[PDB]
């Protein structure tokens, strides 16, 4: 049993909105800064991996299964991605708030009447420190699972994350600080 800890930065390219103004973005209460919930990330990668509870057996072991009579622990433990300290200091260098407001006219074609609405998005350029843990139960399946992790992250870098991304929301870019084995003897450089 080994633990390999993927620490990195998810830099947001567009207006990112995860709304838990029509919908304010979710915020960590302690610092009142915007936050990307780890469940938002994990759900998005799991859905995109499944597309690309009844899922493929590879996906079931990767993100967890709750099937009756056969329960598999989630090999992936996506944690909340908090607002980066470096990005927050970068924002403070300007007279810039961490969250912008986006407006939409929402015109109905039948009546030619537009209903205004507001969406609170984390401004473009914000960075979040993402924490990812992979649990090693089968040693021989780590390389295959990490390939599918790359597939999930690649899909995320092409897709959106939270909010209505079909209109240019929540687009992200993933950079990785280091993928090192925090507990156990597993080789980090292979992954």
């Amino acid at each position: 049993y080994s633990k390999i800890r993927i620490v990195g930065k998810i830099d947001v390219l567009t207006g990112l909105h995860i709304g838990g103004i029509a919908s304010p973005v979710v915020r960590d209460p302690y610092s009142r800064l915007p936050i990307i919930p780890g469940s938002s990330i994990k759900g998005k990668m799991r859905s995109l991996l499944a597309k690309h509870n009844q899922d493929a057996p590879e996906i079931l072991r990767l993100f967890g299964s709750s099937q009756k009579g056969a329960i598999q622990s989630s090999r992936l433990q996506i944690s909340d991605a908090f607002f980066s300290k470096a990005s927050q200091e970068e924002f403070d260098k300007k007279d810039l708030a961490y969250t912008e407001t986006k407006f939409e006219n929402t015109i109905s074609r039948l009546t030619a009447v537009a209903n205004p609405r507001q969406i609170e998005r984390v401004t473009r350029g914000a960075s979040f420190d993402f924490h990812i843990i992979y649990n090693v139960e089968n040693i021989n399946e780590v390389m295959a699972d990490f390939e599918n992790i790359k597939t999930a992250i690649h899909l995320l870098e092409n897709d959106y994350l939270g909010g209505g991304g079909t209109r240019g929301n929540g687009r992200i870019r993933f950079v990785i600080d280091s993928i090192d084995t925090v507990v156990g003897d597993f080789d980090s450089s292979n992954l």
Partner: protein, 306 residues
Amino acid sequence: EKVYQVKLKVYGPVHIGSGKIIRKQEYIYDRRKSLAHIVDGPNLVKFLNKKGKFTAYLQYLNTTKERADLYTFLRQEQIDTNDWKTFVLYTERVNQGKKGMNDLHLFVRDGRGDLYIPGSSLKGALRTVLEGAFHSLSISDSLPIDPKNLAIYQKIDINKELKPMPLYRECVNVGTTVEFTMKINSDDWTIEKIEKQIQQAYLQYWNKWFVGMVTTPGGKAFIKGGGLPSVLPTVLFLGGGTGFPSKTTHYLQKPKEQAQKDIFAILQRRFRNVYGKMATVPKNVPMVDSTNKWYQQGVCLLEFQP
């Protein structure tokens, strides 16, 4: 799922509304230079305190409640020209058709303060083109464009004659290429389908409304000035104020005459003051720059490249 790069060619000024309108007190404007200098809040106030004119400005506000131009205040105090430019955000060229300007509409800006065009503007314009689940159709916000391209333009109404409007809007100048990233699913929508649909949408819009504009003598003057670019393929109207008939399901889903009488009917219900009192269907409904060549507001062209 395939990724297409999208390029927008700004053949006409585009102004997306951000809900922010600023009056003349929030930005300098030189009538002789026809130039507007955008002024932010705190920088103007802190400089005013340093020069000691904060009391004088408040007195100027009290003397004239109806209108207290910032430029006239700078002229009467004879402050240094570079002092005026110290608190300036940026410089934008003004294209007035009227002389001063009453209001100034702001082009949408992100948090960082640069000009960008939202993916919801393209999503809304593209949807009206197709109409006549959209979950596959995914767009992304454009990369920021240079601030120099932003300039103030004036709305012009053409009802058998050219008529300037007191309203001003911030629009991107012509000769601009902005980039998008669009992801599509080969099942629901195809690249060939969307480009063909846009071309048909512009054509039906052209022969149902724009030709009616040309027939009137006011349209002829607009044409002779170059208002309609000779390039006009795929044509869209992203900016607001580009016209009610543009990007409508009425023209595509109804005959030319039936859609026009429905447009007149809905216009008279919404605008009872003017359209409502009209008792006849017009021959063309609705009846409604520093550079020498005139431009039509909102005119733009897409191009999708795999």
